[PDB]
Design a binder for this molecule. Sequence first.
Ligand SMILES: [K+]
Ligand SMILES: [K+]
Ligand SMILES: [K+]
Ligand SMILES: [K+]
Ligand SMILES: [K+]
Ligand SMILES: [K+]
Ligand SMILES: [K+]
Ligand SMILES: [K+]
Ligand SMILES: [Zn+2]
Lengths: 67, 416, 631
Amino acid sequence: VTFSTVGYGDVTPKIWPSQLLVVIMICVALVVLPLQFEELVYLWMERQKQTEKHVVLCVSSLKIDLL
Amino acid sequence: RSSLRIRLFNFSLKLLTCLLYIVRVLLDDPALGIGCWGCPKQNYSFNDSSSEINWAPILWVERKMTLWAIQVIVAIISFLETMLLIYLSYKGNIWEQIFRVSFVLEMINTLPFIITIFWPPLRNLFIPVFLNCWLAKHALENMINDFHRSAMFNQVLILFCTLLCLVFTGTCGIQHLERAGENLSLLTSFYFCIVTFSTVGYGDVTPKIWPSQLLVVIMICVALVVLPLQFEELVYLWMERQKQTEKHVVLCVSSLKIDLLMDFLNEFYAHPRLQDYYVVILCPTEMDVQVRRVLQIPLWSQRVIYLQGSALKDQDLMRAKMDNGEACFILSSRNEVDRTAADHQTILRAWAVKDFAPNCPLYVQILKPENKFHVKFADHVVCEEECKYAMLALNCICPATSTLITLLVHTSRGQE
Amino acid sequence: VTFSTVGYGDVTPKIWPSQLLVVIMICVALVVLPLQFEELVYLWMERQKQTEKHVVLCVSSLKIDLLMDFLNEFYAHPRLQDYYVVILCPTEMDVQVRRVLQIPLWSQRVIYLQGSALKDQDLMRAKMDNGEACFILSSRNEVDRTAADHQTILRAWAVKDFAPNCPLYVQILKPENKFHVKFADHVVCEEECKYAMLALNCICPATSTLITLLVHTSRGQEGQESPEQWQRMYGRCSGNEVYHIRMGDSKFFREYEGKSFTYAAFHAHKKYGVCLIGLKREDNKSILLNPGPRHILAASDTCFYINITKEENSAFIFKQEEKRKIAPVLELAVEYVKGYPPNSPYIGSSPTLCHLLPVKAPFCCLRLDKGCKHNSYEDAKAYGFKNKLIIVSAETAGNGLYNFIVPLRAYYRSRKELNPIVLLLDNKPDHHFLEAICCFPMVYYMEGSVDNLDSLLQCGIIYADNLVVVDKEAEEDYMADAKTIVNVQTMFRLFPSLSITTELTHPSNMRFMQFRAKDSYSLALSKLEKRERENGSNLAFMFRLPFAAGRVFSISMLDTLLYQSFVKDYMITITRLLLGLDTTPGSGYLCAMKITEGDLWIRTYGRLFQKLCSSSAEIPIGIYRTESHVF
Ligand SMILES: [K+]
Ligand SMILES: [K+]
Ligand SMILES: [K+]
Ligand SMILES: [K+]
Ligand SMILES: [K+]
Ligand SMILES: [K+]
Ligand SMILES: [K+]
Ligand SMILES: [K+]
Ligand SMILES: [Zn+2]
C-alpha cells in the first residue's frame, strides 16, 4: 500500500529510522522504476516497426474504388 | 570567465543562507521561550479545542547573536551581487525586471534582513530564507548555459533540483507553520512532505491548523503546475534525442534484404564452430521492414547487429569493431541497375577496410570481371559474371553442372 | 487532498451521503479530466508540426563535411569563441548533422534554422541585421551548377537587400556568374582556383598542396612524435600561415626601414625564419607579391609574411631572443607574339599577357582527332611535339578550362618549355570556348575520357608529363568519388610512371588516390592519420602520400579559404596573386627552380635565400623534396 501510493495509515512507521527508511525507499522506487519503464518504452517502440469461409484478394495496390 | 565566477559565488551564497536557515531551526527550541527579542518572552501551548491560533510562534523565531549578523552579512552580499548584475546588464530594457519572477523572491527574502538592522527587537523576526533555495536553482540554470561542469543530463539534474526545492520548501514551511501547533520537528516534517508529494498520504502527521492546511494545498497546487513543465522539457529533449562478446564478423553491404541476410545466416550458422560469433551489418541504408522482423526473432536478436554507416567513415568502422573482426564480407549489390557503379563502391569498400584493418581477411563479391584486379589483394574474391557464364556454358557441355556445383557449396547433412 | 489522491484521512466523510458523494466525485473526476487531457494531447501533437556576436551560414543543403570544415576553421581562432553560428538552410536537418549538433561542444554554439534567405522573416529569425558576417556557400553536389550559382546570387542579393552593412562571403561555382556578386566583400570562385591550382601543379609540383596547407589554421604540431625525419619536418612546416603587420609596428621588419624589400626578406628570414612575401602600400589597395629590389621599405607599409606564428603570438621567441641576450645582399638596388588573349570568355577575367599565336587558329586545327586541310594528323603521334604533353581529362570545356590554359601560356613562362595542352573532353566544346582558346599555341581537344584507354593512347599519354583528371560523376556521400578514384587507379596500374593529378570532393578520399594495398608503409600512414585525427588536427589527410606529393587536392580547401577570410581579409587576394588569377602591375608570380648537382655547393636553404636575393631578388617560399622510398 506504500509503493501503490494508497497509504492507508493504519500501519505507519513510528520511529525516525523507520520513517527515514520509508522516505529513501520511496525515493529509490521513483528513480529505479522509470529507468525500467523507459527500457520498456524503447522495446515497445521498436516492436511497432478468425471464422471459417473467407476469400483472398491479391492485388498489387488496393485503392478505394477497387475495394 | 569572471561572469561565471560571480554567478557561481552567488549560487554558493544562496545555498549557504538556506543552510544557515536550517542551522537556526535545529538550534531554535520554542518550548524554552518565544518572544520579540529580549524582555517578555512567553511560553505557549496548543489547544485543539480553541480554534484561535496564536501567531507569536509563527511571527517570532529566536535567532542567535552570531546567527542573525552572519545571515545579515550574507543577505547583503547576495543583494549586492544581484543588483550588481542588474545594473551591469540592461540590454536595452530598464523595466520588466521585477515582473520576471526572480526579483520578487530576491528582495522579499533579503531586504527584511536589511530593515532588521534599524530596530533591534525586530532581529528575531521570521523571514522565509528557504524560498531563497528557488533562486539558487535559477542561478544553476544559467550556469548550465555556459559550462557543462551530457545534453539531457542537465535537464534531469535541473528536474532533481526543482524536486529538492519543492521538498525543501515543504519541510521548512510545514515545520515553521506547525511551530504554533503540534510543534513538528524538521525530521518529522521532512518525512511528511515526502509522503505528501509522492501522494502516499499516511496521515500519521497531518496539518492541524488552517495556516498549515492551506500551505499544503498551495504546495500541492504549486507541485502540480511546476513539475509538468519540467516533464515537458524532458519530453522534448527525449524526442529530439531519438533522432558485445569476442569473435564477430562484419558484413558490409549497400542495401540488405531478407534474402541476402538469411542466405548468410543459414550458411554462417550451419557450422558449430561459428556459433559463438555475432554478426555486424554495416549498411548505409535504413533497416528494412522485413529485416527488422527477422532480427526481432530471439534466435537472431543477440547474434545480428545492424549498424547504419559506411565503410568509408573510419568512425563507422570503429563502431563495427572492424579492427577486431574475424572477417569482413564486402558484397556487391546486384539489384542496382549500374553494375560498374556497384563494383566501384565495393572496390572502395574493400580499400577502406584494408586501410583501416590490414589484418582483417576480406571476402569480396565483385560483379564485373574488369573490376576484379582492383580487389586482388583480398583473401577471397568471387566474380559473379565469371562463374555465372562458366556454369552456364558447362551446362551446355555437362548437363546440370550448375546444380552439381550448387549442392556442393551448400552445407547440408544429406537428410533431405 | 482527495483529487490529488493524497488522502490524509484526518478529515473523512462520516456519513453515507458524504461517502457516496466523494465516490461519485472521484468517478466524475476520472471521466471528465481524461477528455480534457486528450484534447491537450491533440493540441500538443498538431503544435509540433542568444548572445551577441554571431555569424550566419546560408546554404541550400548542409552536410556533415561542410559543417565540420566550417566549425574546425571558425573555432580554430580564440577571437571567435564567444561567437555562435546560425545555419539558415531550407532543407530539414540531416541525420548526421543532428548527432554532431547534439554534442555538448556544438549544442550551444550552432543554431540551425530552416528557412530561406529570400524570406525576410527567416532573415529576421537569423538576426542577419545583427550578424557579424554572412557566408553564402554554393552547393557543389547539385548537378546543375548554373542553377546553384543563380540561387547564391539571389541569396547574396537577398542578404544585401536586408542587411546592407553585413559583410558577405560568397562561394561562386562558375566564373560567368562572378560579376553578379562583385559587391560582396569576399568572393571565391571555385572553378578559377581549381583550374589555376591544377595548371600550376603542372608547372610547380604540389602547388595545390602548398596552398592547401597555408590556408589551414594549424599550429605545426602534426607528426611531432613521428620516428621519420621527413614527417616531423613536413608537419612542422605545415604550421606556416600568411600574416600581415604594419612595418613600423613589426619587430620582424622595423629595422629595415629605408632598405629594399629583398634585403628585408632575406635578413628577416636569416634572423627569425619569417618569409616576407609581399607588401601593401598605404597609398594603394593593391597587394604586391615580391615588389623587388627597387622597392624601398617605409613604416606605413603593410608587410605580408609567412611564419609559423603571428608576430604578436610569437612573443615567446622575442623573449627567447632575450634569453640568448655567395655575394652579399645589397641594402640598395613558328614564333609566337606576346599579347593579351582577344576574346575574354567572361567578365572579370583578369587580362594576362600570354604567348599568342600570330594568327587565330581555325577550329579544325584545334582538333587532335580529325585531320583537316592544313594537316592530316589524326593523333599526337603524327604531330611530333617537341615537349611532353599535358592531358586534361574534363567533362565539358568552359570558362574553368580557360583558367587552366592561361597559367600555362603566360608570357613569363619560358617559350621553349611550353607543353602542348590536349583537352580530353566528354562533350564537344561550344564555339565560344574555341574562340577563347584559338589564339593559344599548341592547345588541342579530343573526344574521350580517362576510362577509355583507346582515347588516352590517341591523346599521347605515352609521352604526357601530366594527366590532369577533372572528370565529374550518390546518396552515401563519400561514394561520389568512387568512379574517379577507380578510373584513375586503372591508369596508375597501366602507366605506373605517369603523373596523374586529380581533384576529389572529399579529402577523406585522398587516401585512395594511388592505392597500394600490399604496402606496409602506406598502411602505417593510416595509423598516423588516426593519431592526428585523435589530437584534433584539421590537417589529418596531410601525411597521405598522394596529397603530400601534389597528386590530389580537394575543393573543400576553397571553403576553408573563405572561412579564413573572416579573420584574414588579405587571404583571398594573396592566393589569387600566387595563382596568377589576379594580375596587379608590379606583383610577382609563383615560379620553381630545380636544385641540381651544380647548385649543391649551396649547402643550405638560407644560403640559397642569400644567393637568390643577391642576384635575381626571388624569395623562396619553400622546397618540394623527393626521397627514395622503394615500395
Ligand atoms: K494516497
Ligand atoms: K492516503
Ligand atoms: K552439400
Ligand atoms: K491515510
Ligand atoms: K597552416
Ligand atoms: K600557424
Ligand atoms: K588534326
Ligand atoms: K573526359
Ligand atoms: Zn585546319
